[PDB]
Design a protein around this ligand. Sequence first.
Ligand SMILES: CCCCCCCCCCO[C@@H]1O[C@H](CO)[C@@H](O[C@H]2O[C@H](CO)[C@@H](O)[C@H](O)[C@H]2O)[C@H](O)[C@H]1O
Ligand SMILES: CCCCCCCCCCO[C@@H]1O[C@H](CO)[C@@H](O[C@H]2O[C@H](CO)[C@@H](O)[C@H](O)[C@H]2O)[C@H](O)[C@H]1O
Ligand SMILES: CCCCCCCCCCO[C@@H]1O[C@H](CO)[C@@H](O[C@H]2O[C@H](CO)[C@@H](O)[C@H](O)[C@H]2O)[C@H](O)[C@H]1O
Ligand SMILES: [F-]
Ligand SMILES: [F-]
Ligand code: NA
Lengths: 124, 125, 96, 96
Amino acid sequence: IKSLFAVIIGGSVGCTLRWLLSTKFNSLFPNLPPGTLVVNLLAGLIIGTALAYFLRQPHLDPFWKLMITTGLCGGLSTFSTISVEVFALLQAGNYIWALTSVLVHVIGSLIMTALGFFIITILF
Amino acid sequence: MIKSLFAVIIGGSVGCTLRWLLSTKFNSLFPNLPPGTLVVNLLAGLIIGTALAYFLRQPHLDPFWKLMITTGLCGGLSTFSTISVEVFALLQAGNYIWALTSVLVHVIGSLIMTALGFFIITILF
Amino acid sequence: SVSSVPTKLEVVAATPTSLLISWDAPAVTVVHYVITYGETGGNSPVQEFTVPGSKSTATISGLKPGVDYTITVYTMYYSYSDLYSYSSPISINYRT
Amino acid sequence: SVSSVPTKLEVVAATPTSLLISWDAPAVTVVHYVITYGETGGNSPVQEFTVPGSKSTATISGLKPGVDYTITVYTMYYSYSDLYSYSSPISINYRT
Ligand SMILES: CCCCCCCCCCO[C@@H]1O[C@H](CO)[C@@H](O[C@H]2O[C@H](CO)[C@@H](O)[C@H](O)[C@H]2O)[C@H](O)[C@H]1O
Ligand SMILES: CCCCCCCCCCO[C@@H]1O[C@H](CO)[C@@H](O[C@H]2O[C@H](CO)[C@@H](O)[C@H](O)[C@H]2O)[C@H](O)[C@H]1O
Ligand SMILES: CCCCCCCCCCO[C@@H]1O[C@H](CO)[C@@H](O[C@H]2O[C@H](CO)[C@@H](O)[C@H](O)[C@H]2O)[C@H](O)[C@H]1O
Ligand SMILES: [F-]
Ligand SMILES: [F-]
Ligand code: NA
């Protein structure tokens, strides 16, 4: 139940952030909506830094890392929204941007995870 | 935009909670492609596909309910960051085959589920 | 925030029994356009057909010479908030 | 739920000054194994090195002949709940 509050507090903060950023910026570039991209790049970065940080601090409370990973990053990031954006592009016959969106999200999110991990490991 | 905030939080908290339960339950069963994380993304893919078809046919449905289902439930339920860290770990472990496979199964799988949800409801109505 | 309705709907070319129409795409992901046409002032069934989202022109054939037609174009489009929905129409009159 | 500790740690081959050890991987994503070794007798400094996650054997060189060594292996592993963390060790004794 203490663990449930971590997921809900973290998740609600993340979901709220995703909502604000997406409704703000997605309509600016419809072929690859940048609000949805930024939230995934940002969660990629955060969880990368979490990866490195929590390794070096083995005794940190499981409540905080549950709040950051399952909660914040889990709420902030999204797969379903990419799925529906891409599906729509596919229905629209816009295959180039369908493919590009998938690649930019995957490669971009992995680069951000790597960058967050390596900045913190190179910092220690 | 406060009634709208409750939709995101109620939907999101339900989705996040579901993802937590399913992932902690099933992810350790197959570590090369953790099935809890996959199922939540396949499930959200399905739900939003059916939402796509259903909302089109019901233009007058309250924006509160579709905000709760899409940004809330599907947004909370699905995850990209967890795939990113699973794949990153596989890459660090030198397990490139399953790193690539995980990316492909998540993407193609989620799109198939979105299509299936959309077309079941359009073929139904 | 952003209009999903096309702009500058116009007849670019015409014969007595057909019309080539074009429009400017709205700044949203259009999955398809729906073209409607029928005789102005009613007294004839309105017909419609779709064109893919990539296209921004359409041919309307089988019309009658010297008759006023009401022609409309709307989109079925993806946006973040509403998923798939239909835009309002843009509408012109044109006499063959 | 699932053990991140390796099993069946053993010396598969030996010379007077080296040991080839092997172990069975645990059923989790191991990023790397950490091998430690030191003289069982007294307080010689324990040394350690990593091996990649794909490997499940390691060579320990530069040992002294006829001396008992304590050898341990643990994992740095990815799981869902704890992200990257370190397992408990598995441990054997072996006399060169
Ligand atoms: C990548 C992993 C696999 C995931 C699964 C994805 C499933 C893809 C669904 C595609 O949906 C179809 O796309 C066609 C083309 O995009 C559309 O055709 C439309 O557009 C065509 C050309 O643009 C025309 O020829 C058609 O007549 C017209 O209906 C058609 O309506 C639509 O239902
Ligand atoms: C898809 C495009 C975007 C991708 C984003 C970037 C992600 C790449 C992560 C790379 O991480 C490295 O992975 C190596 C293994 O793959 C590890 O090498 C380890 O394992 C090797 C063999 O498996 C040994 O040769 C090395 O010495 C040993 O350090 C190394 O430590 C680790 O930092
Ligand atoms: C030009 C100046 C650059 C900045 C200088 C920093 C150099 C040392 C820290 C970075 O090391 C990288 O990342 C891992 C460490 O973070 C190393 O993997 C090593 O350590 C890992 C655990 O930390 C193990 O998994 C691997 O097997 C083992 O090879 C890996 O080889 C190396 O690429
Ligand atoms: F999804
Ligand atoms: F991400
Ligand atoms: Na999410």
